[PDB]
Structure formats: structure tokens, C-alpha cells
């Protein structure tokens, strides 16, 4: 399925090149600009434990998910990954625990050493 396809075909967007955050662009966006640290970012997303065991979508709450980029309001993988995206882009991310919730996890939703999968649509972003 989609997690395995990211494993096989995704780009490693980590600085360390440790395969900690792998990306596939599923729908191309527009514009020269990508978000930068500080911007208010609007997304829709579907996320799950990569083994399908738990799911979460912004659509469940009938509203976009909003955060400030590069401020650690989200897991590291989102600060890295969303910074690569264009407005209108849909991307798949597959994320090792080091760029998510680590060995501690974040129970009850996230166990120790969990790999995460997200589909993210970047709706908009605005400068601080
Ligand atoms: C581990 O805790 C959670 C994980 C995830 C979602 C969580 C969450 O909180 C309980 O709640 C939803 C986003 C709704 C409430 N909320 C929380 C925050 N803003 N709104 C702020 C904190 C968000 C932390 O989440 C994240 O950094 C990532 C990336 C942004 C979307 C949500 N993220 C998650 O890790 C989900 C998780 C995905 C895998 C399946 C279980 C939920």
C-alpha cells in the first residue's frame, strides 16, 4: 500500500540522509515559494501508524489543521517535510520514530518506536 510505496520510491529529505523522512509528491502544487520557519501553515491531512493500526484526519474535525512552521508545534518530520511543499501539493510522508515520537512514544495514540505515514495537502501559508 501507500506506506510501502514510500519506502520503495520516496525521496530522503533528511539533512543527515538517514531515511528518517521519505516523501512522494502525489499531486503537484504551484508557486516558487515554499513555507519557511515562522509561517502559519494550513493543511488537510490523513495520518496513521504505518501498520494501519490507528488513524487520524483533519477532516474528522471538519477543519484544516493549522500550525506555525519550524516552531516544534508538530513533530520534526512535519517541520522538515512541509517546508518542501508548494501550495496545492499533496504529498506522502513516511517517518521513522527519530523524527516523530521516538522511543518514549506518546501513549495512548503513539507507541514506542512507531513509524508514521501521512498524506498532507498544503492549503496555504502566511508569513509571521
Ligand atoms: C500525539 O498527539 C497527537 C498526535 C496526532 C494528533 C493529535 C495528537 O494530540 C492528541 O491530535 C490532533 C491533531 C487533534 C488535537 N490536537 C493536537 C494538536 N493540535 N490539535 C497539537 C499536537 C499535535 C501533535 O501531532 C503531530 O505533531 C502530528 C503532525 C500534525 C498532525 C497530527 N500529528 C500526529 O502525530 C497525530 C497522530 C498521527 C498518527 C495516528 C495517531 C495520531
Curated annotation (Swiss-Prot):
Widely expressed, enriched in testis compared to other tissues. Residues 30-118 form the PPIase FKBP-type domain. Acetylation impairs ability to promote interaction between Akt/AKT1 and PHLPP1. Deacetylation by SIRT7 promotes interaction between Akt/AKT1 and PHLPP1, leading to suppress Akt/AKT1 activation. Ubiquitinated, leading to degradation in a proteasome-dependent manner. Deubiquitinated by USP49, leading to stabilization. It is found in: Cytoplasm; Nucleus. Changing residue 16 to R: Decreased acetylation; promotes interaction with AKT1 and PHLPP1. Induction: By androgen. It comes from the Eukaryota. The modification N6-acetyllysine is found at residue 16. Part of a heteromultimeric cytoplasmic complex with HSP90AA1, HSPA1A/HSPA1B and steroid receptors. Upon ligand binding dissociates from the complex and FKBP4 takes its place. Interacts with functionally mature heterooligomeric progesterone receptor complexes along with HSP90 and TEBP. Interacts with NR3C1. Interacts with Akt/AKT1 and PHLPP1; enhancing dephosphorylation and subsequent activation of Akt/AKT1. Interacts with IFI44L; this interaction modulates the kinase activity of IKBKB and IKBKE. Interacts with IKBKB and IKBKE. Immunophilin protein with PPIase and co-chaperone activities. Component of unligated steroid receptors heterocomplexes through interaction with heat-shock protein 90 (HSP90). Plays a role in the intracellular trafficking of heterooligomeric forms of steroid hormone receptors maintaining the complex into the cytoplasm when unliganded. Acts as a regulator of Akt/AKT1 activity by promoting the interaction between Akt/AKT1 and PHLPP1, thereby enhancing dephosphorylation and subsequent activation of Akt/AKT1. This is Peptidyl-prolyl cis-trans isomerase FKBP5. It comes from Homo sapiens (Human). The lineage of its organism: Eukaryota, Metazoa, Chordata, Craniata, Vertebrata. The chain holds residues 16 to 140 of 457 of the full protein.
Amino acid at each position: 500500500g501507500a506506506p510501502a510505496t514510500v519506502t520503495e520510491q520516496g525521496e530522503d529529505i533528511t539533512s543527515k540522509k538517514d531515511r528518517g523522512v521519505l516523501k512522494i509528491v502525489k499531486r503537484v502544487g504551484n508557486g516558487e515559494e515554499t513555507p519557511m520557519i515562522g509561517d502559519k501553515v494550513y493543511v488537510h491531512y490523513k495520518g496513521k501508524l504505518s501498520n494501519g493500526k490507528k488513524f487520524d484526519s483533519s477532516h474528522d474535525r471538519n477543519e484544516p489543521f493549522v500550525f506555525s512552521l519550524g516552531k516544534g508545534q508538530v513533530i520534526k518530520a512535519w517541520d522538515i517535510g512541509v517546508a518542501t511543499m508548494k501550495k496545492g501539493e499533496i504529498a506522502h510522508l513516511l517517518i521513522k520514530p527519530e523524527y516523530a515520537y521516538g522511543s518514549a512514544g506518546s501513549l495512548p495514540k503513539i507507541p514506542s518506536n512507531a513509524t508514521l505515514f501521512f498524506e498532507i495537502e498544503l492549503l496555504d501559508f502566511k508569513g509571521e
